[PDB]
Symmetry: C4
Subunit: 394 residues, 4 copies
Amino acid sequence: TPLALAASSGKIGVLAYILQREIHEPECRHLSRKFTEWAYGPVHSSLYDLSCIDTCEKNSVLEVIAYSSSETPNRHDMLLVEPLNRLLQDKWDRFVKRIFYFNFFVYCLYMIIFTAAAYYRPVEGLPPYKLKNTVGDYFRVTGEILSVSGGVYFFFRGIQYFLQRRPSLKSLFVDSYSEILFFVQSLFMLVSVVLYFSQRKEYVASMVFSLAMGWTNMLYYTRGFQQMGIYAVMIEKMILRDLCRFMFVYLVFLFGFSTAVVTLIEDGKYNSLYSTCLELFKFTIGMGDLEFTENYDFKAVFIILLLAYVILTYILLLNMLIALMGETVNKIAQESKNIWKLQRAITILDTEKSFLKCMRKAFRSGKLLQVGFTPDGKDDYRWCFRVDEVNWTT
Amino acid sequence: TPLALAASSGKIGVLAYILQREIHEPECRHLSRKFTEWAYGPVHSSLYDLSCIDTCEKNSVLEVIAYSSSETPNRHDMLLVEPLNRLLQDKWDRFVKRIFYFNFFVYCLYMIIFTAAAYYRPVEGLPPYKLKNTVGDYFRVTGEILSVSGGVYFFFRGIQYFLQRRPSLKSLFVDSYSEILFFVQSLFMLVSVVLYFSQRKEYVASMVFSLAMGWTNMLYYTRGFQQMGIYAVMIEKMILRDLCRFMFVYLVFLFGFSTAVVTLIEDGKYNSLYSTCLELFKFTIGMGDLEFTENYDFKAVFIILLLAYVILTYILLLNMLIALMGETVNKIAQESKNIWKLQRAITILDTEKSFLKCMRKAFRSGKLLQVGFTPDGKDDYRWCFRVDEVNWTT
Amino acid sequence: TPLALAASSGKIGVLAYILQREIHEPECRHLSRKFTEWAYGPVHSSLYDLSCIDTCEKNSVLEVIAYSSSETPNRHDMLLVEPLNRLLQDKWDRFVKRIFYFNFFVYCLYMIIFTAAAYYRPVEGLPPYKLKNTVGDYFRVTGEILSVSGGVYFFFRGIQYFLQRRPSLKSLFVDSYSEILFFVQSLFMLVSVVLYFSQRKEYVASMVFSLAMGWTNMLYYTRGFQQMGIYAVMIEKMILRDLCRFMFVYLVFLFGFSTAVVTLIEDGKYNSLYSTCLELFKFTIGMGDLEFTENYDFKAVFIILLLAYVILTYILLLNMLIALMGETVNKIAQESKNIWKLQRAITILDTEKSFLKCMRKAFRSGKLLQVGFTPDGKDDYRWCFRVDEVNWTT
Amino acid sequence: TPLALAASSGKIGVLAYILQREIHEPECRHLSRKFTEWAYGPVHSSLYDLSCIDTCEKNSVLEVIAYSSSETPNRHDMLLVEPLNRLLQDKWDRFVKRIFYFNFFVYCLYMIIFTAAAYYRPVEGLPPYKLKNTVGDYFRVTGEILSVSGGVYFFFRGIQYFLQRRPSLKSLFVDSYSEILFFVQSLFMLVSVVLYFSQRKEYVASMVFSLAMGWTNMLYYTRGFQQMGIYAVMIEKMILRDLCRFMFVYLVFLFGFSTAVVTLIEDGKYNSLYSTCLELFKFTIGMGDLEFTENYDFKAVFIILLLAYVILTYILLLNMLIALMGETVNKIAQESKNIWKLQRAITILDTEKSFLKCMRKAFRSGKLLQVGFTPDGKDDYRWCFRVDEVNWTT
Ligand SMILES: CCCCCCCCCC(=O)O[C@@H](COC(=O)CCCC)COP(=O)(O)O[C@@H]1[C@H](O)[C@@H](O)[C@H](O)[C@H](O)[C@@H]1O
Ligand SMILES: CCCCCCCCCC(=O)O[C@@H](COC(=O)CCCC)COP(=O)(O)O[C@@H]1[C@H](O)[C@@H](O)[C@H](O)[C@H](O)[C@@H]1O
Ligand SMILES: CCCCCCCCCC(=O)O[C@@H](COC(=O)CCCC)COP(=O)(O)O[C@@H]1[C@H](O)[C@@H](O)[C@H](O)[C@H](O)[C@@H]1O
Ligand SMILES: CCCCCCCCCC(=O)O[C@@H](COC(=O)CCCC)COP(=O)(O)O[C@@H]1[C@H](O)[C@@H](O)[C@H](O)[C@H](O)[C@@H]1O
Ligand SMILES: CCCCCC(=O)OC[C@@H](COP(=O)(O)OCCN)OC(=O)CCCCC
Ligand SMILES: CCCCCC(=O)OC[C@@H](COP(=O)(O)OCCN)OC(=O)CCCCC
Ligand SMILES: CCCCCC(=O)OC[C@@H](COP(=O)(O)OCCN)OC(=O)CCCCC
Ligand SMILES: CCCCCC(=O)OC[C@@H](COP(=O)(O)OCCN)OC(=O)CCCCC
Ligand SMILES: CCCCCC(=O)OC[C@@H](COP(=O)(O)OCCN)OC(=O)CCCCC
Ligand SMILES: CCCCCC(=O)OC[C@@H](COP(=O)(O)OCCN)OC(=O)CCCCC
Ligand SMILES: CCCCCC(=O)OC[C@@H](COP(=O)(O)OCCN)OC(=O)CCCCC
Ligand SMILES: CCCCCC(=O)OC[C@@H](COP(=O)(O)OCCN)OC(=O)CCCCC
Ligand SMILES: CCCCCC(=O)OC[C@@H](COP(=O)(O)OCCN)OC(=O)CCCCC
Ligand SMILES: CCCCCC(=O)OC[C@@H](COP(=O)(O)OCCN)OC(=O)CCCCC
Ligand SMILES: CCCCCC(=O)OC[C@@H](COP(=O)(O)OCCN)OC(=O)CCCCC
């Protein structure tokens, strides 16, 4: 359709024009989109025809925008057009706000069960473990089998993401950061089951990375909270635009001077590359030891290197990272809000493919008062609408 | 009254119109508010009729604005209208500035007595304590009974706040942060008396929280000092808008990775959840120890977790908090000043209900030259006024 | 004079008008200030009459501006008027730049002598000390008597500051920070001589404060270096506007919670108020120890207090100070430059009262081509001038 | 030539005029520069005559701009003129992008060889070392002789820089920071060979400074990556504008108070100036020890000095450096991008003097359709061109 072709390429001017057309003419109500029904005292109502916007067949304007390949003109600004913004607010507060908070309540009760099933793991060797008849057993083994089943659930839910949208290796690593992190979490959990029944103690490695990931994935549910959701979008921007640029340059100075400190150190505990790469990393934390070794030669060389480390990477690069984060906050004060609107918009559309059996409640704002004097005949119950309101001063 | 109805809903345009009306017409001085008496060389005087603004009966415009429910249109901007701003400056420098500094001088001499009565507390067991005939006794027991009486005073003064304004469970936790903190301070002090005479050593817990709170409550008196008062408003904004958003996300990463570090640690001192949640909190301070334990397995797993902690929460989240505080300073450079004007305005109105017996000094700028040719008759001593001045250029 | 009355009150509009007047009329060259001599191709010269501006008798416009009481309208902006700004640049690069750098070269060679005379102080008891016949003696005792003489010099130079300008107890602590710090430095040095010959070892206390002050006073000479001088003005603004507002609130939380930690601590090493006020100050540095004591009761109370300290004063107030310094840089990006221009302007005028015996070199830009057809007669060598240049486009 | 005279002095208005002239007149195509060949639907082509811009004889406009003495009007803005900007983009993506990445791939494989040849250096005394017949030998000695040859290569490539451009002692230390750091790296490597065969163990000093420098020189290749290259320009600006101004003032307070701490310390381990200048430097890192010594007198003096250190240089100067970096990011948000465009432009022109034997591929955009009706005759294959494109709306 030519409407969805404007949405797919991101033509924001045309998409504003089609969703907001209105003209006073005979045989124009067959063509017009925005209808103005009630003209009372200066607050005037408005009805948007909403034909293929929300509930179209296999190509809907909400589904075209929210599933974009992130290479469009402006995928984040199209949801600010007057029919689309209030409808997603209407589908939120009426329908999906209750079913989103229940999903966050399940996942918060998922990680409590999975923590307490891992916190009280058995300590003796040779997995697996014959559960005793005690009250502590039959009560965390039920905690384990629920926690494994959650890793199975996010695995099959992670596959059917890829089986539907198919981001195809570029929109994967660019526009779908959230669904990978649910999948990699479930991937460590299933590897930790395979290593558990193969009688190896290294399952607790993959369990921990399945547990460290799982709490950091709880920032996914900060969307649906406006002040928190815009905050978690900014955390995404600091990783992709500052630690992409800091941790390259920092690890050059880190691995650079640590290889310069080893070759000066003659022998001892810190003779390896690993044991002194920590000792130069401790300056970044705030636990840097200047005299961390004595067994070398040329003390004047050894402390010029540390001072050239501390001047270059501690009182410059960490104090420069704070300044560059200070500029990307003022730059992404508006763009990070619009990216939050798109993150809510995906979660709204995801539940309509989930709670699809009761498809009547997904429809918005009634289907009535359609065709006032249609030229093809009397079809005044054809298309839906959505009521808004306006302001004063004529 | 229709004037206070504009103040209660926060109609700033109407409230500017009523307090500043003036027109040259016969039988208009009965209706006009702003009077221009002395028209000398280009500095021209101005008199504001001030009828129900300051000293009305049970609904005054200062009392309506300053006791707002924080849900109005602009409660912080209405005090910038030309009669209201200079009057609160006039009631400050003439009347309430002396009686405010005495209240800060009492409370500063309250916390010195309450500190020194707690610093020299008796150390032996089984409270209470038979005071000896020494000079040190009969000199801190008098220090205690004054300090208990201060907790009684802020308790009854905290009740009669709630018995008058009745914030009703929403304006309580939103618009009245200061009066709760005086009340909770007095609440710990009275619990520390009940535990004292019930022969339990745990009174010193509630005494300390009554003493730690009491010095932090001394930031209440930073209002009445313009450069300090605007500074303490900004401390309120950083708690409610940044540590509301930092300490949620920080404690997710903190409790997330600390539960990931326990389940890797086999046994030892740091096997509990509490003993290692401190050890990951020490990275935020600047005392983080990378090799804080050795009794585990898979050292490569244990230090990926700490590095994934330090990268995520130390060189990102603390360096992001500084950037987000850097944006909310430039955003609240003006709003935090106007909130300080409202905090002074409450303290001005609070003393008129306190020093009410000498109610003549509360009246401002005389009650004279009222009705120049009133149409109802000769009533030229009816209503008050307030003199201002103007500038040059006609 | 009415010219200096505009400079004393800071009327910048009138002062721009008097120093830049020019009109084409007969008998106007007796009244005009700005003369335009050479009108070549579009670069046009300009001559400023400069009568009472620089070299007046007992009231000169440079001396009136630069010796202001800091209560004027704009004392920092009057030096941007076109005759005054290029003249101070002319007196700098031609005359005072060489004699300023020699004063910085003496004072830099003063603190090297005074350091090395204190670094090698004798270590045995009972001052004073009979100097031996060694080569090390008769070589630092000469270093001492030069360093004492420098303290005598800054003492008498500090008195004759006050004997001339007389800031009178308000402009002292507001507009003359630099001359106090040279005086207090010399004051510790002279007290350290009185305690030296009175056979008390406490002279080394006042010597150290005379030595710690003396190197911090070397930031005085950062003026005369434009990028450094504007930087040292900003250090003055961070002390007077941020550490005036931080160190009040910080010491309230510091002394507040430290008195809350003592009264919980039963007995031991940290039972005093002083020994734990350091231990809460170490959290600000980055050396804060959470488990710094064990001899108390109610461990849950003891670590709520430390966490309520660290949350309130470390991850809030130090991270808020960086944000507030980030706003006062953008606010004082222009004002701190103009304050540097006034700090140079005082140092230019101070040497004309110092190198006064050769008063001919202090005069600027010649005294010639004065009165072209003066109406009182032929007086064409009466008043001086100063040549400038202009730009293209007619 | 008068064109290059506009480029050498940096007349950006004239240089925009000459490279973009076009007029419709007979006998104007002999004089015009910008040709508009294809006028289709509203995208219109454009051809730039490009005569002495890129491939002139001994004075080319790209070579004049990119080899400027940094004292011109705007050397960084001239590359934004419409022929020059797209041509350097054309010579990048077509020709030099492949040969730049190979140079970064060689140098990255140079420092890996030079690290691993230094990491496994022999530990016994008396250099040089008779290589054994083992497999580890004949495999790092080949690693050494490649790493020495790289120091020889950057030495002769560093000389022929100076033998061609001749920056002449002012553009050396101002406009050529990169080529010095490649040269000083090679200078330490060759000194480390001379000390190696002169049987002295101090070669490992100069090897380390040749290895610490060499990894920091890998930030040279961040140009050619747009988000990284603009980032490394900003690192240059923080060194030259903030650590030029911080490390002067910081070392005054550091050396100031450390000389004040020595003269108070009577005797012991920290009696020297060096041993306590570290202990005051550790406060900047975050490892400052307040009670780092006890053997002195007047403890009240000793901790006023440390608190006057920590207040002045830790909670002021490091927190002021972050604010001043926060202002020079917003100030150099645009200038640092244009300096990156000039750093790419030098690397493009450097390879045309390197890959000069295949000089045909250096020519851009063909040499055809030159002279449409030249007045001197038929010379329609005289000068080259370069095709661009334009936008809609007539
Ligand atoms: C141990 C590693 C932990 C990493 C911590 C990060 C946790 C945050 C989890 C999270 O919410 O992911 C967020 C981003 O976090 C990251 O991807 C960080 C990358 C770390 C390698 C949200 O990304 P989404 O998957 O929701 O995708 C969004 C987002 O990409 C946005 O930019 C637009 O593209 C679109 O709106 C949409 O694609
Ligand atoms: C141990 C815990 C210590 C907490 C430290 C904070 C001490 C500061 C005390 C203080 O002055 O409280 C200030 C705010 O501090 C806080 O409430 C911090 C909340 C911490 C949970 C002032 O609040 P007020 O009670 O004066 O109310 C004001 C204020 O709310 C303003 O926003 C507007 O609403 C109105 O002007 C008025 O309602
Ligand atoms: C151990 C204590 C060390 C304190 C460190 C600060 C050293 C800096 C020395 C210094 O240069 O003083 C500068 C200011 O430093 C301070 O006063 C800091 C106050 C610390 C209590 C310059 O002040 P001036 O004496 O030159 O006066 C100037 C200045 O006041 C300006 O604001 C205007 O008023 C006028 O131009 C003129 O009056
Ligand atoms: C152990 C010491 C390590 C120092 C670390 C810094 C490494 C960075 C290496 C580097 O890329 O050098 C960059 C600058 O780094 C420094 O010079 C830092 C100075 C440290 C004393 C790039 O400089 P260029 O040589 O490419 O020259 C450029 C640059 O000057 C620019 O400003 C303009 O002048 C011109 O575009 C051109 O001249
Ligand atoms: C969901 C599975 C939980 C099973 C936990 C379990 O078997 O341990 C039994 C007790 C642990 O108490 P103890 O500390 O005395 O046991 C020693 C630890 N292995 O459990 C507890 O006392 C606290 C339980 C907390 C659950 C939220
Ligand atoms: C500039 C030197 C200051 C005096 C210190 C000195 O010369 O000695 C060289 C060494 C060791 O210093 P020490 O005072 O401890 O001397 C003990 C002799 N091994 O210390 C150094 O080498 C310090 C190098 C600092 C470079 C920034
Ligand atoms: C307001 C009640 C104060 C009562 C304090 C008291 O009884 O102690 C008597 C002395 C304490 O001196 P000591 O340190 O020798 O006493 C041992 C401490 N228990 O008191 C002092 O020496 C200092 C008193 C300071 C008051 C501001
Ligand atoms: C989200 C809950 C996850 C389960 C946490 C858990 O098993 O910890 C239980 C106790 C610690 O008890 P112990 O350390 O004495 O048990 C010894 C275990 N080897 O510590 C606690 O109860 C911590 C509760 C803190 C909740 C915020
Ligand atoms: C990338 C490896 C660098 C060389 C170090 C190495 O392989 O050993 C693995 C362990 C221990 O390192 P060590 O050098 O101390 O080896 C001692 C053997 N236990 O150290 C680690 O596991 C480090 C993990 C770092 C991940 C960022
Ligand atoms: C200006 C007065 C200087 C007098 C210094 C003095 O008497 O000491 C003599 C020697 C000190 O050498 P030593 O370290 O061996 O002396 C032991 C220290 N008391 O001096 C030196 O070796 C270094 C002198 C440095 C001067 C800049
Ligand atoms: C606001 C004053 C509150 C009372 C403070 C107090 O009792 O401390 C008194 C002394 C400490 O004396 P001691 O530690 O020797 O007394 C031992 C007590 N067990 O230390 C001091 O006097 C500190 C005074 C600092 C004021 C800023
Ligand atoms: C929330 C409790 C988490 C589990 C820890 C707990 O309950 O014990 C109370 C104490 C001591 O904790 P331990 O695990 O070391 O128990 C040892 C018993 N003394 O630790 C505390 O009191 C911690 C207070 C933290 C408040 C933020
Ligand atoms: C390019 C020259 C490299 C020569 C290195 C060499 O001679 O050492 C031989 C072995 C070192 O293994 P070891 O740790 O057992 O040798 C003891 C260290 N002197 O080498 C290795 O095992 C690792 C080689 C890594 C090369 C990238
Ligand atoms: C501005 C110079 C002031 C004089 C400094 C001084 O006497 O220090 C001399 C030496 C230290 O020699 P020592 O520590 O061995 O002398 C022992 C003294 N008890 O250390 C040095 O020489 C430091 C020189 C550093 C200059 C930047
Ligand atoms: C303001 C004093 C607070 C009470 C502490 C006091 O008076 O003693 C002076 C010394 C030592 O303090 P102590 O409590 O450890 O007393 C032990 C006696 N040597 O400590 C000091 O000198 C502290 C100087 C702090 C200046 C900011």
